[PDB]
Specification:
The structure is cut from a larger assembly and holds 1 copy of chain A (255 residues), 2 copies of chain B (403 residues) and 1 copy of chain C (386 residues). With 403 residues, chain B is of the alpha/beta class. Chain B has helices spanning 8-26, 69-74, 96-105, 107-119, 136-152, 174-188, 196-204, 207-226, 235-240, 266-272, 300-313, 353-367, 374-378, 387-402, and strands spanning 2-6, 49-51, 57-59, 61-63, 126-132, 157-164, 194-195, 246-249, 287-296, 325-329, 341-349. The longest helix of chain B is centred in the middle third of the chain and has 20 residues, at 207-226. Chain C is 66% helix and 2% strand. Chain C contains 17 helices and 2 strands. Classes of the chains: A mainly alpha (255), B alpha/beta (403), C mainly alpha (386).
């Protein structure tokens, strides 16, 4: 009731779990050019001045706790400039026992994995308007875009939307803090399992060809488009292969 | 944000009922005031409306017309005060050539209005056009505006709800206007075909009800954009996932046909969206793309099961040379949820080619005898020759060959 | 905490307490010691009246805390519906979904896949309207061939209620569940064969040369479905509905939780005895298995005779629809008539051996008394025994 | 699950009163609402009904008819709103050939409806057909539907409640329709004969009451399927245990004939089910199979004793070349248990052959003089010749020989 916790986690799903795309569609639209610069070349007083603006202009303005978002440029990527960006969140003492540094980097691990897929299909969809006024590269773009759109819909409406709805109900039947601490870290170690975060490093290389493909089309050749097809389709038949050998993790193939 | 350009009597009405539906959904009073129950609303309003210092909301709409009567009636409606008198334009004083000539004549004020509206939006995304392709007003004026807009704004989307003439029912000069408007649509339009024939067929089995259905289609298409969620948070996301289109909506039920409260799963809806009967428009022709937006409670497990079963039942056919999509939204918190779950479908299918083959057949059925060309020769564009017509016909033929 | 940790010391009993009175104190002490730890709850002639006063109050309270806080009775009924197939509606759907899986060998079978199927059945059938607690314990286990030999439900139970079942009732129910699982698939096989004949004659009713041998395929079925559909009744009325009634009658009147154990323990010694799963009735069950096998061999010797007639019918269809040559097929049609008496000698020797194993089965029943009610079920109207 | 296909006036009514009985049994309100006392019900409803998002339940029924009047009256009943308007079909505008011709003509919409209904059930088990074999509508339409269904769905059961024409009472063209419908029944039907003559005989000793009795028979036949127990938990179990049929029901007592509350054992009931009088239909002919479903309290010891005594008393006769069944169910918890124990019997008996021998005799009594063939020649099927008739007659003769 006082210093509420359930009305305090929904202020995290709005930013970390990317439940509101009205703040992102407006933030990357501002800080795109100033993130492609390499690291140790961008001024952090500029990004915070862009984050602080992207909120109040969007629909995230109606939030009591919006003043707790800080930029934190991590040193190592999801094992530069753009692949080293992630929010940071600060809380007071009484609410810190629940959401601590041990259980906040996990919120910060499964965010970058969803900012990376959100970044590529934001540009891979951007090359679509450049070609709209040589004719065999479209049938490959259809194969790539329909794969990242099929990962995100699996990662939002299948893993992080159902598991969160459990936690909301699983906190009304709690009896003590030693249980709320069990239903929270019991929600994070489940998301990082149904997601590919825990190995499946071929996903990282598979997204590598997609960003390169957008780059090639950004310079506007006839012999390299067919190379990407043989390269990208080879990695996808590897992803669908390992995702089949399991005892969810089997419903992904139907996605 | 977005702008709406509605032309001709058809477009003018289309806009009237589209904005009626919008204000109903967002709890906007007829005068532009906001109801007390909707004061704390979470719905995004910037997309179609911009608020005013007087707290009222104004649509991002412009009214165009060669004749005054329709808009004059509109301004006598209870919704009259809502629109912006500045944006509305009426000609002081049925042919495509005449329409394009006027468009050349009245460039300045129209683009003044368009620029004024554009500069009031930070993140304008594209354009929306509502018009009929047969009548003189809609066809020619839309042609001119599309040309000069694609020229002026090379970085904005252009979406249209083009109404096609009835064919089973015999505009006497419809073939020319339709063919020319199609030329312009292929040559400039970014991306929703509409026909009176099948639309009224489904309505059966006044223009007020027909266009109420059309506005329903438009609003359901723009729902998720209006109501931000997780995925598909932009029009460009919509277009990329598909790219000519056709549409269908499951809960097209009268206000009197709510008595049959049928237990409506997601599976049955998404299934219903596939049948040719529900496709509101009238060679093993197959699909190119399918999108299903679902409103109401939805379990992604149900969606996966429905997709699996439909795939196994092979009720659909796809291109052999290339490798659908099911998006979910939330209903407005205000209109009654008479439907447990509802579905809208937009698809690209090769069969649409037939449309043009008819019109081409119609046009070829006239060009061989030079019927009703006297008026066209009057205008400057067709004063010397009609090479425009030949180029348009060949362009449409090329499009049909490509399909 | 019941079977051990308490011993009646025969040496230090005072003479002025009769040997029976010394077993009412060891039972009142145990009833209170067990009420605290495991159940997790905290509160001459006048001498004889004190022991009984401490008995008719403590024990009567032990059942109340064991029926309201744990619902000991609501599990006995629920452990009959599922573990003893007493539901019927749920086991029907569960045998239709495990069919595509269990046909494969056991090596490709993994437990993590079947649970999604079991969970689907409990949702579709009427078992969904049920207490969520008892549904938490119902799961699957994999005995350690074919998928129809290693599947079985478990319904594990731990805690205070585990003092009524004691790891031996769970080692007896599974000993029963096999006999009720076999006698349930041997019936859904025989209603599938009967379903085939109900579609067979609706297609090839135009070949009068085949109905002569097809007839023996029907009679052998209806003579076989009787023996199964009759023994299936002896399971319901003579074993389940009768031996359970002597349990719910000695529970609504029992008390002190030691007339309940002894009433539920003998309830598992009659079902084992009324079914043929005893130790000295071994010669009987192995005799029944042979009859259970002859039902499978019919299904294998039927589709062969079924499909061989559909191929010849399909060719005879295409051999005339495309043309509307004539001599090269009459030898194929002529030889097809010659293979018929070969198949007739199969169903003539399969039947004559099926009757030789049933007429031998009955002789073994005249051996230990409730079985006499079975010999009447099978031998009704005296079709056997000449 | 199951579907019901009822044709002709006879079938339409049959369905009306069958669903009346069902909703009475399951506590379903006339409008499809569920009564408060039945909220926690344990009865299985999916078998004949599917619930709707509005909480109402819809029958898995389709209405077919060559004429509107009957169904129009149905929709004026208090039960009108219950049915699904989508499924109901009425011909926009008395012969078998005409019926089959129309069936060929209206294939598409009928099978559309059937497919829509089928796809809403996970575990559909078979089909139920209610129709009359004499009238033009029922005979021909059922013939066509059976043919195209056995073709379409080769893995579903097909059960029928076929009503046979009265014979003691003199359709003038009944022999042709009956013979053809019988041909189709043998050639496609999986498995309940019915005649007006003996039915009205037992009723004595309006169509409303006759069909109330018929619906009683149908519901009592489907009881155990509706109410799951231990044995006989599927229609296929029923069919396998028997396989043409005839039926009888003991407690066929008027609402005024409850005054004689006769102590009704199971033995007396099962005995009563054997007599020819109770067989609702009209060479040492013998039985093939007997099934007795018993409702109410029942002791299997009583059942065994009754079986023993009847076997000893040899009141029945069986085939010499082959080696009954007594199943038990539970009454619905709602309808009054005016009967302590009740019994329904379905049997296969050779004597039924006589039926066809009569109709054949009837048909042969006409084909020799070419009576009333003028209308048949009109239709395409009998436009050239009548070889269909000869084949049907020979098929029926073959069936009689087989019996």
């Amino acid at each position: 009731e006082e210093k509420e916790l359930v009305a305090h986690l929904r202020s995290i799903k709005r930013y970390f779990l990317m439940d509101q795309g009205d703040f992102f569609v407006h933030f990357m639209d501002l800080a795109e050019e100033e993130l492609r610069k390499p690291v140790e070349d961008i001024t952090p007083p500029r990004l915070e001045a862009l984050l602080e603006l992207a909120l109040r202009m969007s629909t995230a303005n109606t939030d009591p706790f919006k003043d707790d978002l800080k930029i934190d440029l991590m040193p190592h990527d999801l094992i530069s400039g753009l692949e080293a960006f992630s929010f940071d969140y600060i809380v007071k003492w009484p609410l810190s026992l629940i959401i601590n540094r041990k259980a906040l980097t996990r919120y910060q691990m499964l965010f970058r994995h969803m900012f990376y897929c959100k970044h590529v299909e934001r540009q891979l969809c951007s090359v679509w308007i450049s070609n709209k006024t040589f004719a065999g590269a479209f049938t490959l773009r259809q194969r790539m875009l329909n794969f990242v759109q099929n990962i995100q819909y699996y990662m939002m409406f299948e893993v992080m939307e159902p598991t969160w709805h459990i936690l909301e109900k699983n906190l009304k039947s709690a009896s003590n803090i030693d249980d709320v601490l069990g239903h929270h870290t019991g929600f994070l170690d489940t998301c990082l399992k149904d997601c590919m975060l825990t190995l499946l490093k071929v996903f990282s290389k598979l997204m590598s060809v997609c960003v390169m493909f957008t780059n090639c089309m950004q310079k506007f050749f006839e012999a390299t488009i067919n190379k990407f097809d043989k390269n990208f389709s080879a990695h996808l038949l590897d992803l669908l292969a390992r995702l089949s050998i399991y005892s969810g993790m089997a419903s992904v193939i139907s996605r | 944000e977005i702008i709406t350009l509605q032309l001709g009597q058809c477009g003018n009405q289309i806009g009237f009922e589209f904005w009626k539906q919008l204000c109903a959904e967002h709890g906007i009073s007829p005068e532009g005031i906001v109801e007390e129950f909707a004061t704390e609303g979470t719905d995004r309003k910037d997309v179609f409306f911009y608020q005013a210092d007087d707290e009222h909301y104004i649509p991002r709409a412009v009214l165009l017309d060669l004749e005054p009567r329709v808009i004059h009636s509109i301004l006598n409606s209870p919704y009259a005060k809502l629109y912006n008198p500045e944006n509305i334009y009426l000609s002081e004083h049925n042919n495509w050539a005449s329409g394009f000539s006027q468009g050349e004549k009245i460039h300045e004020d129209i683009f003044d209005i368009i620029d004024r509206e554009a500069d009031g939006s930070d993140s304008l995304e594209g354009f929306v056009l509502c018009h009929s392709i047969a009548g003189g007003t809609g066809s020619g004026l839309g042609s001119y505006l599309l040309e000069r807009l694609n020229d002026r704004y090379p970085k904005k989307l252009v979406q249209t709800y083009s109404v096609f003439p009835n064919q089973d029912e015999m505009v006497v000069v419809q073939p020319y206007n339709s063919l020319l408007t199609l030329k312009r649509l292929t040559q400039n339009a970014d991306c929703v075909v509409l026909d009176n024939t099948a639309l009224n067929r489904i309505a059966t089995d006044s223009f007020s009800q027909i266009n109420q259905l059309v506005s329903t289609i438009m609003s359901a298409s723009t729902t998720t954009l209006r109501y931000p969620g997780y995925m598909n948070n932009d029009l460009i996301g919509l277009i990329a996932s598909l790219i000519f289109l056709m549409t269908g909506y499951t809960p097209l039920t009268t206000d009197q046909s709510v008595a049959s409260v049928r237990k409506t799963t997601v599976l049955d809806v998404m299934r219903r969206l596939l049948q040719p009967k529900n496709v509101m428009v009238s060679t093993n022709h197959c699909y190119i793309a399918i999108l299903n937006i679902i409103q109401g409670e939805v379990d992604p497990t149900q969606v996966h099961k429905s997709l699996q079963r439909i795939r196994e039942r092979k009720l659909a056919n796809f291109i052999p040379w290339g490798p659908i999509q099911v998006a979910l939204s939330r209903k407005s918190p205000y209109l009654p949820s008479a439907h447990r779950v509802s579905g809208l479908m937009m698809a690209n299918h090769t069969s649409i080619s037939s449309l043009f083959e008819r019109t081409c057949r119609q046009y070829d059925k006239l060009r061989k005898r030079e019927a009703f060309l006297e008026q066209f020769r009057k205008e400057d564009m067709f004063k010397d020759n009609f090479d425009e017509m030949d180029t348009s016909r060949e362009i449409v033929q090329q499009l049909i060959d490509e399909y | 905490l019941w079977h051990d940790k308490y011993t009646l010391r025969k040496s230090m009993i005072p003479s002025f307490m009769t040997m029976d009175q010394s077993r009412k104190v060891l039972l009142i002490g145990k009833s209170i010691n067990f009420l605290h730890q495991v159940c997790h709850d905290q509160t001459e002639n006048a001498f004889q009246g004190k022991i009984d006063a401490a008995y008719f109050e403590t024990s009567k309270y032990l059942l109340d805390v064991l029926n309201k806080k744990y619902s000991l009775l609501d599990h006995m009924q629920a452990m009959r519906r599922y573990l003893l197939l007493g539901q019927g509606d749920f086991i029907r759907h569960l045998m239709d979904l495990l069919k595509p899986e269990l046909v494969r060998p056991a090596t490709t079978l993994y437990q993590h896949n079947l649970t999604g199927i079991l969970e689907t059945a409990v949702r579709a059938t009427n078992a969904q309207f049920d207490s969520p607690e008892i549904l938490r314990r119902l799961d699957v286990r994999l005995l350690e061939d074919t998928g129809w030999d290693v599947f079985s439900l478990d319904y594990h139970v731990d805690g205070p209620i585990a003092t009524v079942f004691t790891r031996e009732c769970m080692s007896h129910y599974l000993r029963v569940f096999n006999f009720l699982w076999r006698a349930k698939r041997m019936e859904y096989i025989l209603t599938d064969i009967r379903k085939g004949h109900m579609c067979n004659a609706k297609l090839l009713r135009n070949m009068p040369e085949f109905s002569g041998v097809l007839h023996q395929c029907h009679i052998l079925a209806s003579e076989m479905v009787h023996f199964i559909h009759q023994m299936q009744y002896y399971i319901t009325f003579e074993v389940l509905e009768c031996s359970w009634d002597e349990l719910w009658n000695k529970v609504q009147q029992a008390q002190d939780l030691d007339h309940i154990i002894a009433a539920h323990e003998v309830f598992l010694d009659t079902i084992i005895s009324r079914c043929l799963l005893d130790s000295d009735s071994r010669a009987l069950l192995n005799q029944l298995r042979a009859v259970f096998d002859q039902i499978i061999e019919l299904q294998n010797a039927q589709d062969a005779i079924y499909r061989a007639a559909l191929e010849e019918l399909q060719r005879r269809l295409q051999f005339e629809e495309k043309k509307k040559e004539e001599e090269e097929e009459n030898k194929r049609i002529g030889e097809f008539k010659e293979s018929i008496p070969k198949m007739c000698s199969q169903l003539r020797i399969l039947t004559h051996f099926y009757q030789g194993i049933v007429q031998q089965f009955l002789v073994l029943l005249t051996t230990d008394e409730s079985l006499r009610f079975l010999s009447f079920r099978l031998d009704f109207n005296e079709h056997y025994k000449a």
